[PDB]
Amino acid sequence: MGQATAIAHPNIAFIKYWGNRDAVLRIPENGSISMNLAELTVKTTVIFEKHSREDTLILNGALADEPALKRVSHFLDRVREFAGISWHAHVISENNFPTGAGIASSAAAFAALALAATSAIGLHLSERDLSRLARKGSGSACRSIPGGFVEWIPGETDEDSYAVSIAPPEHWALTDCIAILSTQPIGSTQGHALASTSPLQPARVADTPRRLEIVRRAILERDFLSLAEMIEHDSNLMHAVMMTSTPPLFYWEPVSLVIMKSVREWRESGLPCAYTLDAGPNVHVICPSEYAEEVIFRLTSIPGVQTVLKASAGDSAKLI
Amino acid sequence: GMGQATAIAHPNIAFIKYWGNRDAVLRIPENGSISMNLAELTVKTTVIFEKHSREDTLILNGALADEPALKRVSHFLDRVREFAGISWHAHVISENNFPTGAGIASSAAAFAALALAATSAIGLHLSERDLSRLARKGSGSACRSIPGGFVEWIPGETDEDSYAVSIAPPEHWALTDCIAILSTPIGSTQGHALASTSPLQPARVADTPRRLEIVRRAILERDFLSLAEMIEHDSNLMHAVMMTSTPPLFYWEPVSLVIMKSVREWRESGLPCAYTLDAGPNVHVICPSEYAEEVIFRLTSIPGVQTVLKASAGDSAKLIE
Ligand SMILES: C[C@@](O)(CCOP(=O)(O)O)CC(=O)O
Numbered sequence: 346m347g348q349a350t351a352i353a354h355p356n357i358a359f360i361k362y363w364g365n366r367d368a369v370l371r372i373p374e375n376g377s378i379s380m381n382l383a384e385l386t387v388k389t390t391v392i393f394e395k396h397s398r399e400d401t402l403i404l405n406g407a408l409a410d411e412p413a414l415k416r417v418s419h420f421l422d423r424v425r426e427f428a429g430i431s432w433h434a435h436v437i438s439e440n441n442f443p444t445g446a447g448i449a450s451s452a453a454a455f456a457a458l459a460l461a462a463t464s465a466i467g468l469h470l471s472e473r474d475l476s477r478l479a480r481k482g483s484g485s486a487c488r489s490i491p492g493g494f495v496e497w498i499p500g501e502t503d504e505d506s507y508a509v510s511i512a513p514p515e516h517w518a519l520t521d522c523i524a525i526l527s528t529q530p531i532g533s534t535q536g537h538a539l540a541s542t543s544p545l546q547p548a549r550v551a552d553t554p555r556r557l558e559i560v561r562r563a564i565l566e567r568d569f570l571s572l573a574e575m576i577e578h579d580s581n582l583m584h585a586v587m588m589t590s591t592p593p594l595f596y597w598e599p600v601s602l603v604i605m606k607s608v609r610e611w612r613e614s615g616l617p618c619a620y621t622l623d624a625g626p627n628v629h630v631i632c633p634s635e636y637a638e639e640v641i642f643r644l645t646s647i648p649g650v651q652t653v654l655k656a657s658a659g660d661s662a663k664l665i
Numbered sequence: 666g667m668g669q670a671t672a673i674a675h676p677n678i679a680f681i682k683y684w685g686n687r688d689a690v691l692r693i694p695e696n697g698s699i700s701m702n703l704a705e706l707t708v709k710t711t712v713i714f715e716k717h718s719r720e721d722t723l724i725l726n727g728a729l730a731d732e733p734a735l736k737r738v739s740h741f742l743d744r745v746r747e748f749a750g751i752s753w754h755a756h757v758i759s760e761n762n763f764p765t766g767a768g769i770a771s772s773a774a775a776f777a778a779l780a781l782a783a784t785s786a787i788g789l790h791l792s793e794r795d796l797s798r799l800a801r802k803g804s805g806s807a808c809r810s811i812p813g814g815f816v817e818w819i820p821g822e823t824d825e826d827s828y829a830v831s832i833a834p835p836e837h838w839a840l841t842d843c844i845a846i847l848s849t850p851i852g853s854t855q856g857h858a859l860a861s862t863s864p865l866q867p868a869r870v871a872d873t874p875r876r877l878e879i880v881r882r883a884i885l886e887r888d889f890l891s892l893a894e895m896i897e898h899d900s901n902l903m904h905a906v907m908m909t910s911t912p913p914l915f916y917w918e919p920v921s922l923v924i925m926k927s928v929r930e931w932r933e934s935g936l937p938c939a940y941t942l943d944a945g946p947n948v949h950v951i952c953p954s955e956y957a958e959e960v961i962f963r964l965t966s967i968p969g970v971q972t973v974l975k976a977s978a979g980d981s982a983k984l985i986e
């Protein structure tokens with residue numbers, strides 16, 4: 346009755362999404378900018394079938410838990426509403442993420458699902474509409490629909506909240522050296538909802554355009570130092586909000602702190618690199634790709650760093 | 666020998682933090698703060714005004730102070746000289762019992778003791794308010810070591826308006842500060858000035874009355890859980906601002922974070938305690954005193970904790986001998 350397969354990459358936010366204006370629609374409180382990660386992929390096949398009563402979900406070869414299925418089912422309901430078709434679908438998804446490494450899959454997964462599910466049900470959405478749809482699966486998924494360096498235009502409405510590519514992957518050879526911590530959280534959905542308990546979240550949110558403008562310009566101009574200092578600042582602002590929520594969300598591990606301090610010292614001593622952390626203790630170390638081997642060496646030397654994943658700028662979600 | 670006096674004062678641990686100045690020179694803070702004096706740590710300072718001294722001299726634990734420390738003390742004594750209308754320079758002899766290398770800041774205790782010894786030596790009989798106001802200009806938090814016990818710094822907007830008062834005497838509430846000294850340090854002065862670079866500082870500052878009102882009530886009501894949750898929140902707010910300054914100030918060490926998480930776990934599992942951190946990695950673990958031995962036992966076992974200092978609520982700065 347209709348089938349398609351799409352791949353999408355996770356992304357690393359240079360300017361973080363944290364907090365929703367609308368939790369249901371995943372309209373964020375602030376805009377965000379990320380880079381897709383080429384070497385990590387979710388591949389998702391959607392198969393719409395005649396009179397399948399309910400949707401099904403398999404994840405990396407295994408029956409998905411009911412939470413995951415429900416979430417994917419509600420998402421497909423949106424694809425059904427948008428398409429006025431009623432078919433239920435079998436969803437098969439796999440990713441190549443290193444096991445236990447704590448790399449969040451939701452952005453890649455809902456980007457791939459948005460593209461596979463709409464293509465399977467016969468639609469031909471623009472990138473913008475795919476981003477808007479993916480967004481409602483998981484906010485950051487909207488940024489994995491476009492390619493390369495991506496900005497989520499936060500908006501106030503479902504139509505207005507979507508992501509676009511600032512620059513293609515080939516515009517700037519940046520590498521994300523992801524320090525995976527051996528010892529290793531509260532999910533994004535709960536965390537976003539808790540942001541409003543932090544006294545500092547409104548101020549963080551209100552300041553986001555300043556930060557976005559710097560990062561956007563830095564990407565366009567390939568100004569690594571400006572990017573570096575702002576991504577650390579923006580990471581720290583998000584974590585500041587997290588840590589001052591009620592209950593506090595302390596995603597950092599002790600080694601996360603060692604890495605953050607080490608990266609700053611490395612940069613200040615001549616090695617261009619910068620850190621950023623999502624809702625977890627892994628440290629993404631962004632650097633011009635020519636420095637990645639040196640960064641990885643230094644990260645690998647830090648006690649407590651299990652392994653370092655090397656990712657370059659990835660393309661948009663694609664059908665295969 | 667134109668007048669001499671000796672005073673003692675204790676350092677203090679802020680439950681609601683001072684961070685950022687409205688007026689850096691006068692150490693008028695952006696926000697109010699609340700602290701508890703630490704009985705078991707003391708600075709004892711003798712001030713002897715000398716007709717023959719051309720400049721002040723500062724002796725610390727029997728040794729000549731570094732030049733920066735002398736300059737701070739001499740600038741402070743200039744304020745006393747001005748206030749008193751007297752010219753004399755002084756010998757300042759100070760001792761303290763702080764554990765060596767522990768990173769326990771002495772400046773609040775030092776300037777509280779100096780404010781009291783110096784004014785007493787020079788013939789003045791200042792009210793606590795005026796002593797606090799004076800101590801504040803040596804080091805802001807010293808204004809909180811002038812009064813006793815649990816102390817609130819009224820932030821104010823003027824030199825006359827910024828001073829601390831006792832919320833409650835030490836005996837009002839048996840709380841212990843179990844200070845986890847880490848085995849493995851940008852100064853406050855630079856740090857406060859950088860607070861203005863954090864996008865989050867205005868919001869932290871504007872929220873302080875909410876936090877002060879909770880802690881003040883918690884102290885008056887002996888409500889440990891309310892105190893506990895607010896001191897951790899307040900500590901994290903300050904460190905949030907520090908970590909989001911430009912350049913960032915990351916005072917936490919990895920072990921700091923271990924302790925912070927451990928403390929929250931301990932409290933949630935039924936051991937009443939709460940963490941707070943100043944501008945450094947040591948973790949002050951506040952708890953009702955009946956739990957201190959267990960808190961200390963748990964803290965002592967944490968790798969990277971060099972030692973744990975046990976402090977109870979201390980009295981006001983006092984003249985002695
Ligand atoms: C914490 C962070 O990863 C957002 C997570 O958002 P989501 O709800 O998992 O899409 C930050 C970011 O990616 O912008």
Ligand SMILES: C[C@@](O)(CCOP(=O)(O)O)CC(=O)O
Pocket residue numbers: 677678679681682683684698770772773804805806807853854857943944
């Ligand atoms: C960081 C903190 O210790 C303030 C230090 O201030 P100062 O050293 O008196 O300038 C917090 C506080 O004690 O309120």
